[PDB]
Amino acid sequence: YRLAAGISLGLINLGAGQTKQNVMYEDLTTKLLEIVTSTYDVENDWIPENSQIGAVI
Amino acid sequence: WQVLGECYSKTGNKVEAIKCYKRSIKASQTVDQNTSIYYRLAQLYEELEDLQECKKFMMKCVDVEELLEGIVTDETVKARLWLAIFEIKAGNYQLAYDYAMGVSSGTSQEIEEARMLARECRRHM
């Protein structure tokens, strides 16, 4: 489902990243990067590694 | 006269429908009644493949809203949304920004269309 969600979000906002709306796009960009780059010593329940693929896609 | 154009519009006699509505515009006693005529008349030019011509009637319909101390009517809501869309293609983001905010008191789908456009023009402003 999280992979399905990630491709879903990416497709809806396809071609919305060529910005030099940017504030919310930048906020969504940094939020996704937080998901993909976060390192957790203790596994959190509601942010597992299963969402990593969806965030990348 | 308004009815005749609709019949002409529905029968693919668009060249005739332009003059029909133009006759209707003179017969109207009050300008406010022309708001509906202006929008649909502008559409008839759009299908006649000349976007420049329809801008002049498009100016008038929105300007009626200002002349009526902000009537904020439905057929100007679709006018302002289309005008802002074309202005983005024209590259004039500042001239398109005020159009989106002025139409921010319409329907549920109308306000979101202008709000997103307002963010689009404010990005390049």
Method: cryo-EM
Q: Roughly what angle, to the nearest 10 degrees, separates helices B35-46 and B14-27? A: 160
Closest Cα in chain B to A22: B123
Which among B21, B81, B18 has a CA at the least distance from the CA of B44? B18
Q: How far is CA B75 from CA B41, B66, B72, B112, in A?
A: 12, 14, 9, 17
| Cβ <8 Å between B123 and A22 | yes
Question: Which residues of chain A are within 8 Å of residue B122 when distances are taken between CB atoms?
Answer: 21
Q: What is the resolution of this structure in A?
A: 5.4
Distance, in angstroms, between B81 CA and closest chain A CA? Answer: 18
**Rounded (5°) CA angle B86-B89-B92:** 90
Q: In angstroms, rounded to a whole number, what is the distance separating the alpha carbons of residues B46 and B28?
A: 24
| Cβ <8 Å between B120 and A19 | no
